[PDB]
Design a protein around this ligand. Structure first.
Ligand SMILES: Nc1ncnc2c1ncn2[C@@H]1O[C@H](COP(=O)(O)OP(=O)(O)OP(=O)(O)O)[C@@H](O)[C@H]1O
Ligand SMILES: O=C(OCC1CCN(CCNS(=O)(=O)c2ccccc2)CC1)c1c[nH]c2ccccc12
Length: 327
């Protein structure tokens, strides 16, 4: 069977905390009043939730209302507990209220309003300095949630809200977030296809906070090389092939050997043989200004098959790539 794995940082944060911190099913929801809010317009509808721009009539302030679909309403206590535990933390979205929808029974989460929408809208037009600046801001949020014993598990450009005018950033959508418990086997059906770590693609369930660091590495490669997404898989199997064409097959097989990971037999005839490519191969005249030896060294230390070898959020913050950022 597979060889066990544990996080190399914040390993036992939840073992010491009182049961109330991580036992989300025991949490008692003190519901608010739905009538205090007026919906203005639908911002979007996904497979699990619906988001609206709204106004709190009790104080004239602008809010964001997220209504849960009945199918995704099962783990609402988990998302509430995580949001309350992280409230006030650096670059973390603030939960202001929890109400029930008027027509349907389903819970609705109320948040602070954040200007300029999606990270994806701006992340392909940033200067070198701005990529460095915003990467440091995301790292503050990830080190904070990891230090609090929580994995985000859905890091991607659509989940980062940036107010470019005020040089402000917020990490949103904590619907897939989970408490890290050493030795626990988690569900591998998390994160968006292009941002899934190799541990999810090979069905290795004993993963940790380092999953978020692979997703962050995917975001960095897309920004500095102007290629969105960087790893463009057709499905979950082709996603691993796309990765293998860059990182090579030798390091992939060394990874499955280290943790005694059983590979799906459908990978035998699609993986092939590939050597580790130099990051300089993705450099061209149109993206050369966004690339530096520091950027390539940093990217190389994030995008590693072995989840235990990747830089942690705190080590990433120490990298020379961030020396030019004003602190
Ligand atoms: N707290 C917030 N403040 C301001 N805008 C928000 C907030 N939360 C979500 N939005 C906006 O609401 C819109 C609807 O988001 P929606 O959840 O439908 O997309 P998504 O789920 O992020 O995309 P994906 O399906 O890739 O996850 C988004 O464009 C997003 O920018
Ligand atoms: O005007 C209001 O609600 C109008 C609508 C009442 C009906 N609901 C539909 C909920 N049905 S649902 O099946 O839960 C659903 C469907 C799609 C996506 C997510 C969830 C949409 C909003 C509200 C006024 N204050 C609120 C506070 C929370 C939620 C809604 C409101």
């Amino acid at each position: 069977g597979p060889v066990p794995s544990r996080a190399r940082v914040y390993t036992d944060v939840n073992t010491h905390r009182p049961s109330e911190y991580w036992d989300y099913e025991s949490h008692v929801v003190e519901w608010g009043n739905q009538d205090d809010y007026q919906l203005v317009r639908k911002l979007g509808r996904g497979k699990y939730s619906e988001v609206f721009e709204a106004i709190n009539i009790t104080n004239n302030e602008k809010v964001v209302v997220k209504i849960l679909k009945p199918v995704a309403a099962a783990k609402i206590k988990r998302e509430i507990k995580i949001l309350e535990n992280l409230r006030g933390g650096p670059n973390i979205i603030t939960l202001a209220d929890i109400v029930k929808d008027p027509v349907s029974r389903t819970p609705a989460l109320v948040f602070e309003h954040v200007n300029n929408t999606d990270f994806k809208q701006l992340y392909q037009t940033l200067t070198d300095y701005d990529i460095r600046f915003y990467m440091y801001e995301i790292l503050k949020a990830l080190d904070y949630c990891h230090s609090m014993g929580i994995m985000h598990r859905d890091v991607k450009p659509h989940n980062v809200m940036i107010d470019h005018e005020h040089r402000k950033l917020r990490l949103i959508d904590w619907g897939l977030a989970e408490f890290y418990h050493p030795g626990q086997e988690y569900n591998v059906r998390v994160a968006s296809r292009y941002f899934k770590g190799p541990e999810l693609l090979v069905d290795y369930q004993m993963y940790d906070y380092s999953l978020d660091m692979w997703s962050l590495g995917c975001m960095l490669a897309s920004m500095i090389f102007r290629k969105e997404p960087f790893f463009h898989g057709h499905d979950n199997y082709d996603q691993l092939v796309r990765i293998a064409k860059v990182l090579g097959t030798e390091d992939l097989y060394d990874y499955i050997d280290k943790y005694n990971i059983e590979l799906d037999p459908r990978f035998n005839d699609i993986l092939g043989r590939h050597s580790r490519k130099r990051w300089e191969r993705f450099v061209h005249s149109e993206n050369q200004h966004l690339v530096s030896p520091e950027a390539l060294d940093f990217l190389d230390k994030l995008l590693r098959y072995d989840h235990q070898s990747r830089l942690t959020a705190r080590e990433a913050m120490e990298h020379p790539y961030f020396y030019t950022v004003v602190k």
